[PDB]
Design a protein around this ligand. Structure first.
Ligand SMILES: NC(=O)C1=CN([C@@H]2O[C@H](COP(=O)(O)OP(=O)(O)OC[C@H]3O[C@@H](n4cnc5c(N)ncnc54)[C@H](OP(=O)(O)O)[C@@H]3O)[C@@H](O)[C@H]2O)C=CC1
Ligand SMILES: CCCCCCCCCCCC(=O)SCCNC(=O)CCNC(=O)[C@H](O)C(C)(C)COP(=O)(O)O
Ligand code: SF4
Ligand code: SF4
Ligand code: FES
Ligand SMILES: [Zn+2]
Lengths: 119, 112, 688, 332, 185, 62
């Protein structure tokens, strides 16, 4: 990793040694549209959150709590890999699962069972 | 004055590093007076601090990255020369400073 | 251009490939694709309401109407087959005017209850109404209404929002296999229902919540809790069974809101079971969060991590090396099992095993405990022989694909085991070991079909491994496999189906029990999340340590409790029944002072004066690489190397005791579901 | 005694430590640092105060929102103390006075209040950790009346609660201390610094931040501190002369010492002693000529060679020559 | 005078090796040029009789993390004499120094300082290139897409230290990101 | 009567008698000041509840 851009960027050294996941989010199961597909994202695995003991709000101490979901998006895997390489982040890539178009026809709903077999 | 043109080789980058280091070293007397660092730090511990920063940033081989690092260091030096930053800030950045590491981190929290 | 959603078109041959013009663009599709599929290949995404790629075609909604040159009227692209030279048009005024007509008809009797609908920010009806619909409504008369009906404790039903796409009916008839739902009535008064008052008892019944494009069918436990835009989506996998379904955990802060499926053509194929979907409730109940040690009177006091580790490390040095027993759980990941095995081995013991199939099984060759036929490869089988297994309760998705193969390829299923309920037609060959002898010798009528099947598929269950005659049964099955060809270079048929998520990784790592009478002559037992073992076998003098995340019967007998993190809170590798390695992604923070299992075991090793070379999660995976190097090559489809010929001849005698059922309560299997509130009202009204 | 802390954050301002402390007398010198270090870990602090509502105003900044809750109370009344102590797993006592008010004598302000606070914690079972802060020279034979009262409060607290740790620091140095600041004020007002003993008595100044960190570490212990009496002292054994030399070094003025033997300073501090009674109950408090302090500065006060210290809590005191005394540049 | 005339004139008069992309639309006539020809183009467009562009409206940067040349620097120009607007764009990554135009337009100084502060793009021959908007000692360039919205450090008063201090950020309520994107877009 | 929660207050309003098989609930006398129109089917024995108001409607005769 040639994280020179990470050194000349301004990110603190503690946050430059994070482990990220480069992945392409898949289509939701509750909708049939395929518009929010093809974009690649960097997941910082920001899970350290707790509950405010005054109002129950969700508190955090991680700056990269919503960056990869809100602003940082890429059009291809190579772009995200290059970004992580230049920022010195240890990354692993999750290849997306894609559907396979099989042969389906309306006539298969109405198919002959076969001659009555007294087996 | 103006920002110098981007360097073309590593020798020019090294020359700029040395020039910046010399300028920072000449800036040491001014800081000891602008901020009450007389009875605080030796006039060489700070010099060692800049040397240590240059040395732990010494694995860069890209002239553009070296020039950007020099520019950022010069900006920091100019800010410190002015009264812009607070007194403890430089004393908080520019001062030189048993069972198992894993077991202490385990006793601390789950998030290493 | 690329197909919509990165869809992969499989051309069997280059010759059988017609050419169509979706929008003036040359598109090559195989003979058999429809106009909608051809448009999907050409990057054009057609509106749809009643069409689902996993359900039979039924052109009800009339929303995918397009224009074809040699057609006087618009054609339903979902059902119209693609013809060579056909010129499709999607963005013409005809197709538009059809789409705003159909949307206007669909939004005519629909109730004005978007704000209270749980499908609010994720509805296909309103999303397509905004895009392909009109702007102003011409309808002012009175709308129709229907009463709501109870379908159980899992599916909330508001049938006024039904658009009558019959996708739920088709799913129940084809995929679920339990025909209990249908379209009742005629005309605008037609309704979806069971007619009689009955509840959805299918293990795949929760999938009707996703196939429903509107808020007519919604989750009852996840009713009004949150909206979709409030939820962070994490792509994780299942640990409830050994199938390892790809799920998507949605959370709002430090708690998990819901679990929905995720596409994986090779494992789950867009479906998950009811135990997967509603197991998120137990992740927030009865969670161990603090280290605890019993007092003199017999009560657990909360103690710091340092003192609990000190106590266990002090007691571990007072027992003989062979007196130490370490038992892994069914939810354990591979790294924690490797750490536990190393720890116990360095202490001088060799008794490390898993909750379930750990009775002495030989994991020496890796084809004897894996689905040597891939799950997706079961679709090419012509005859399934289920020897002592009930996939409906053990591996619900394997049962789903078996039902798919039976209803599509007219395959035959022969079942040898205890009486049970099947969602497909099965012939009850027998109920015990004697049936296997009958099959092996021949003259049995099912043997004719077995030997006259091109691709037979024998599926042995993990429950056949706790028996005393295990070697004899595994030899009879192998004899059947050899005599009636099922294992060939072009097709492998012999399959073994595991029930626990950790069994495959445990067998790969060598976590196999050595002595049968090891938990009776023990003095220090480290239950690493293993609460599915009968603690009454443990002697009363043993020092039992329970390291897990949920409280169960093992807690009432443990001396030290070490809190742990759940599968939604850690990075772990799990292996499927088919040998496919996947990784979980953390979604929510760990609760209380709980740590990852491998961290707790390594810290215990350090306190017990045993050095472990590795100190990080990457160090563990390097150690695993020297034991099971296929557990670090995640997302790789590595087939088995050798076959059943290597096994030494074992002339034992098959017992006479009939096979048993391993899963009695399908909704009460692991500790997370055992602590859930949904799984109680599901095991109380849905199980008969 | 584990169960008084449960970390629920990153150890920052918005983090959550499972500590809910009631710090009596937190409006003084040490309280301003103890409450700040308690709030930094995410611990809720209840600050009971008396009199004006502006006294605890500066403590609200330390917590995030509701972490610091000032509550009025009256030491004479007992139900107020119980009300301000209900929601508390930890109680810290900092109540003490070095001069004498006609409303509260040396015994009342140092011993009886501590007794009442210990008793109320006794009936209100549930305080896991109780800390009472005496002074290093506390002994029954001490000529100073304040130190004897603090010692008696020590036995009272230990008897009423054997689990109560007694942190026993020495003379504190800080931005708002009552030893260095009065000296500089006198120097800027009269030109010379009087020495009530000729700059001979030896004592062990300690940084107030070090004492606050010691109390914090005693709270966040492994259980060893329970029922112990630490003696918090500085690294260097200074004297009244060498400390004044450092003060002149910081204040940048030419030294000028007026040596004064013990009898003359004792007789010069005497007038306030027998004039505590008058038409007004309040009377100008002593600054450098407290009779009690003069008596306390007759016997050398050093940390016991056979008693618990800073290094028994894994703490290193600051050297009171640089940062600890940097506040003296305001008179420069 | 107009987008139809300016485009055709600049097509002919301008040297071809300068501009490599010329969009002519109603949203704005743009010129995309290499960073080593920006000063030449802007000096030509400031002195030519028929393209008297004498006003530099502003200089902005746009962050595209998916591109190799990450940052896009846009020069919005105005011609008072002919009542027309021209936009000139270049592209630069994080370690390239583009030429400064303060020599031609004196108002370019503060906008170039703001671009350097917000994106980290350095300008050659700029009289003084220091941060203009962010706090003194600010680390990082906020207007980048990878910079967190709330930043990395937070400011509070430290009573023992008797000064305003900077501490790592810790939100009492984190920013809730709502994903309203539709799959039918 | 602050002791009564809104659930208990809406559980005390008697159901509205409707002659037909379906009723339209708007939530207020003035339609623009209520909730979106809700058509409720009165083809059961239990009173039918408006999902916005909480008001219950029951069939009058049959
Ligand atoms: N050099 C030092 O400062 C040393 C201090 N100590 C001990 O440390 C403890 C605190 O240190 P410090 O902060 O300097 O003490 P301070 O005198 O500076 O603060 C005194 C606190 O006690 C409260 N208090 C005093 N008398 C009464 C009373 N009669 N009833 C109720 N509350 C009262 C005050 O409240 P109000 O302000 O409203 O009266 C104030 O909050 C004291 O007990 C002191 O003896 C030990 C050794 C040396
Ligand atoms: C109070 C003062 C304020 C400002 C203080 C300074 C703050 C910023 C500190 C500087 C930050 C930087 O990284 S700017 C300097 C960074 N640039 C480099 O390190 C160039 C790569 N190093 C090399 O080429 C060699 O190792 C070399 C070290 C040159 C010598 O070795 P040789 O010649 O044998 O080859
Ligand atoms: S199903 Fe869709 S359109 Fe109908 S009310 Fe619910 S969100 Fe609105
Ligand atoms: S209930 Fe849902 S899936 Fe079933 S027919 Fe109605 S809209 Fe379609
Ligand atoms: S999707 Fe084709 S008619 Fe409904
Ligand atoms: Zn209503």
């Amino acid at each position: 990793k040639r994280g020179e851009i990470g050194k000349v960027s301004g990110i603190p050294e503690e946050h430059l040694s994070r482990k990220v996941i480069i992945y392409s989010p898949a289509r939701t199961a509750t909708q049939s549209g395929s518009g929010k597909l093809g974009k690649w994202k960097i997941n910082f695995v920001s899970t350290l959150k707790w509950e405010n003991p005054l109002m129950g709000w969700t508190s955090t101490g991680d700056p990269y709590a919503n960056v990869g979901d809100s602003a940082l998006a890429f059009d291809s895997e190579e772009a995200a890999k290059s970004f992580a390489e230049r920022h010195g982040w240890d990354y692993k890539v999750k290849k997306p699962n894609t559907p396979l178009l099989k042969v389906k026809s309306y006539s298969d709903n109405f198919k002959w069972k076969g001659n009555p077999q007294p087996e | 004055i103006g920002v110098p043109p981007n360097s073309a080789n590593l020798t020019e980058a090294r020359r700029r590093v040395f020039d910046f280091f010399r300028a920072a070293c000449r800036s040491i007397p001014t800081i000891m007076d602008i901020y009450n660092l007389q009875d605080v730090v030796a006039p060489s511990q700070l010099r060692y601090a800049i040397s240590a920063q240059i040395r732990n940033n010494a694995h860069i081989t890209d002239p553009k990255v070296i020039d950007l690092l020099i520019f950022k260091g010069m900006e920091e030096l100019t800010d410190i020369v002015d009264h812009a930053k607070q007194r403890h800030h430089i004393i908080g950045q520019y001062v030189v400073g048993g069972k198992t590491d894993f077991l202490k981190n385990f006793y601390t929290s789950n998030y290493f | 251009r690329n197909p919509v959603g990165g869809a992969r078109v499989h051309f069997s041959n280059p010759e059988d490939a017609i050419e169509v013009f979706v929008d003036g663009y040359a598109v090559k599709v195989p003979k058999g694709f429809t106009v909608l599929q051809a448009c999907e290949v050409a990057g054009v995404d057609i509106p749809r309401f009643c069409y689902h790629s996993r359900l039979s075609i039924a052109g009800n909604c009339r929303m995918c109407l397009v224009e074809v040159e040699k057609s006087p009227k618009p054609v339903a692209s979902c059902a119209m087959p693609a013809l060579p030279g056909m010129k499709i048009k999607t963005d013409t005024p005809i197709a538009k005017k059809a789409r705003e007509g159909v949307m206007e008809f669909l939004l005519m009797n629909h109730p004005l209850d978007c704000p209270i609908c749980d499908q609010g920010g994720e509805c296909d009806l309103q999303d397509q109404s905004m895009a392909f619909g009109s702007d102003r409504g011409r309808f002012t008369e009175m709308k129709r209404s229907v009463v709501d009906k109870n379908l159980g404790p899992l599916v909330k039903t508001v049938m006024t929002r039904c658009i009558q796409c019959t996708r739920c009916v088709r799913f129940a008839s084809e995929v679920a296999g339990v025909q209990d739902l249908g379209i009742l009535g005629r005309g605008s008064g037609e309704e979806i229902g069971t007619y009689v008052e009955k509840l959805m008892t299918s293990e795949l019944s929760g999938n009707v919540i996703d196939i429903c494009p509107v808020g007519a069918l919604t989750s009852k436990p996840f009713a009004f809790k949150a909206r979709n835009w409030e939820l962070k989506a994490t792509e994780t996998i299942d640990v409830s069974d050994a199938v390892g379904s790809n799920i998507r955990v949605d959370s709002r802060g430090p708690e998990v809101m819901r679990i929905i499926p995720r596409l994986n053509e090779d494992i789950n194929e867009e479906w998950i079971s009811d135990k997967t979907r509603f197991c998120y409730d137990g992740l927030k109940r009865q969670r161990l969060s603090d280290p605890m040690i019993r007092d003199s009177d017999g009560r657990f006091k909360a103690v710091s991590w340092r003192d609990a580790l000190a106590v266990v490390g002090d007691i571990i040095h007072q027992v003989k090396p062979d007196e130490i027993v370490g038992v892994a759980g069914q939810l354990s990941d591979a790294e924690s099992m490797m750490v536990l095995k190393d720890f116990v081995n360095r202490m001088g013991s060799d008794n490390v095993w898993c909750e379930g199939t750990a009775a002495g099984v030989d994991a020496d060759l890796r084809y004897s405990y894996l689905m040597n036929t891939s799950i997706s490869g079961l679709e090419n089988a012509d005859l399934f022989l289920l020897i002592g297994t009930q996939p409906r309760v053990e591996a619900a998705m394997v049962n789903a694909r078996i039902c798919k193969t039976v209803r599509a390829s007219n395959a035959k299923v022969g079942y040898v085991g205890p009486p049970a309920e099947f969602n497909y037609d099965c012939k009850h060959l027998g109920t015990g070991p004697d049936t296997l002898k009958e099959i092996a010798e021949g003259r049995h009528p099912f043997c004719t079909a077995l030997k006259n099947a091109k691709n037979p598929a024998i599926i042995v269950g993990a429950g056949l491994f706790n028996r005393t005659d295990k070697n004899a049964i595994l030899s009879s099955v192998e004899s059947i496999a050899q005599a009636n060809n099922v294992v060939r270079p072009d097709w492998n048929g012999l399959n073994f189906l595991l029930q626990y998520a950790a069994q495959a990784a445990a067998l790969d790592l060598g976590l196999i029990q050595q002595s049968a009478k090891a938990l009776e002559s023990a003095k220090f037992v480290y239950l690493m999340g293993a609460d599915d073992v009968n603690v009454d076998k443990i002697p009363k003098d043993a020092f039992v340590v329970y390291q897990g995340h949920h409280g169960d019967k093992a807690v009432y007998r443990a001396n030290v409790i070490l809190p742990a993190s759940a599968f939604t809170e850690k990075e772990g590798t799990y292996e499927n029944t088919e040998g496919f390695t996947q990784q979980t992604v953390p979604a929510v923070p760990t609760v209380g002072d709980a740590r990852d299992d491998w961290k707790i075991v390594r810290a215990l090793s350090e306190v017990s004066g045993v050095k472990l070379p590795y100190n990080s999660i990457e160090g563990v995976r390097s150690r695993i690489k020297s034991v099971a190097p296929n557990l670090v090559h995640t997302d790789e489809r590595e087939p088995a190397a050798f076959g059943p010929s290597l096994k030494p001849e074992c002339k034992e005698a098959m017992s006479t005791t009939p096979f048993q059922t391993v899963v009695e309560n399908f909704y009460m299997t692991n500790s997370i579901t055992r602590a859930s509130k949904i799984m109680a009202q599901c095991s109380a009204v849905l199980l008969k | 005694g584990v169960g008084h802390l449960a970390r629920k954050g990153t150890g920052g301002r918005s983090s959550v430590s499972g500590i809910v402390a009631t710090v009596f007398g937190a409006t003084g010198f040490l309280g301003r640092y103890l409450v700040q270090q308690l709030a930094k870990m995410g611990s809720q602090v209840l600050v009971p105060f008396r009199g004006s509502e502006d006294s605890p105003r500066h403590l609200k900044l330390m917590g995030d929102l509701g972490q610091v809750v000032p509550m009025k109370f009256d030491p004479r009344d007992e139900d107020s103390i119980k009300a301000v102590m209900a929601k508390a797993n930890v109680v810290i006592n900092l109540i003490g006075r070095e001069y004498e008010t006609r409303n509260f004598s040396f015994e009342d302000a140092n011993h009886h209040i501590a007794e009442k606070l210990a008793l109320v914690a006794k009936e209100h079972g549930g305080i896991m950790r109780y800390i009472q802060v005496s002074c290093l020279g506390a002994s029954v034979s001490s000529p100073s009346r304040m130190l004897r009262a603090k010692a008696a409060a020590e036995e009272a607290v230990l008897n009423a609660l054997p689990e109560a740790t007694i942190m026993r620091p020495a003379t504190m140095i800080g931005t708002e201390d009552r030893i260095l600041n009065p000296w500089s004020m006198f120097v800027k007002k009269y030109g010379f610094l009087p020495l009530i003993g000729g700059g001979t008595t030896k004592f062990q100044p300690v940084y107030v931040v070090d004492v606050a960190a010691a109390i914090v570490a005693a709270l966040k212990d492994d259980g060893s501190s329970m029922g112990k009496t630490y003696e918090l002292g500085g690294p260097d054994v200074f004297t009244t002369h060498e400390l004044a030399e450092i003060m002149y070094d910081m204040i940048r003025e030419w030294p000028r010492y007026v040596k004064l033997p013990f009898p003359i300073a004792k007789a010069m501090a005497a007038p306030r002693d027998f004039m505590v009674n008058k038409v007004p109950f309040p009377l100008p408090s002593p600054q450098i000529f407290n009779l009690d302090q003069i008596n306390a500065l007759t016997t050398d006060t050093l940390v016991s060679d056979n008693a618990l210290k800073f290094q028994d809590l894994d703490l290193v005191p600051h050297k009171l020559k640089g940062y600890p005394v940097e506040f003296l540049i305001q008179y420069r | 005078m107009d987008n139809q005339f300016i485009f055709k004139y600049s097509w002919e008069t301008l040297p071809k090796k300068w501009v490599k992309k010329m969009e002519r639309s109603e949203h704005g006539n743009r010129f995309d040029t290499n960073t080593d020809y920006l000063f030449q183009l802007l000096c030509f467009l400031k002195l030519h009789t028929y393209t008297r562009v004498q006003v530099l409206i502003d200089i902005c940067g746009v962050d595209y993390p998916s591109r190799k040349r990450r940052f896009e620097v846009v020069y919005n120009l105005l011609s008072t004499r002919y009542n027309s607007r021209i936009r000139v764009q270049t592209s630069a990554d994080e370690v390239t120094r583009i030429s400064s135009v303060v020599s031609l337009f004196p108002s370019a100084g503060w906008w170039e300082r703001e671009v350097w502060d917000m994106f980290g793009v350095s300008f050659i021959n700029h009289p003084d290139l220091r941060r203009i908007l962010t706090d003194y000692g600010f680390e990082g360039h906020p207007l980048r897409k990878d910079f967190p919205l709330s930043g990395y450090v937070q400011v509070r008063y430290d009573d023992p230290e008797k000064r305003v201090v900077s501490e790592p950020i810790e939100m009492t309520q984190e920013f809730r990101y709502f994903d309203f994107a539709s799959p039918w877009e | 009567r602050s002791k009564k929660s809104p659930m208990e207050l809406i559980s005390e309003v008697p159901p509205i008698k409707v002659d037909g098989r379906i009723v339209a609930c708007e939530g207020d006398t003035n339609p623009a000041l209520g909730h979106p129109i809700e058509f409720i089917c009165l083809d059961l024995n239990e009173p039918a509840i408006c999902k916005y108001c909480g008001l219950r409607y029951v069939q009058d005769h049959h």
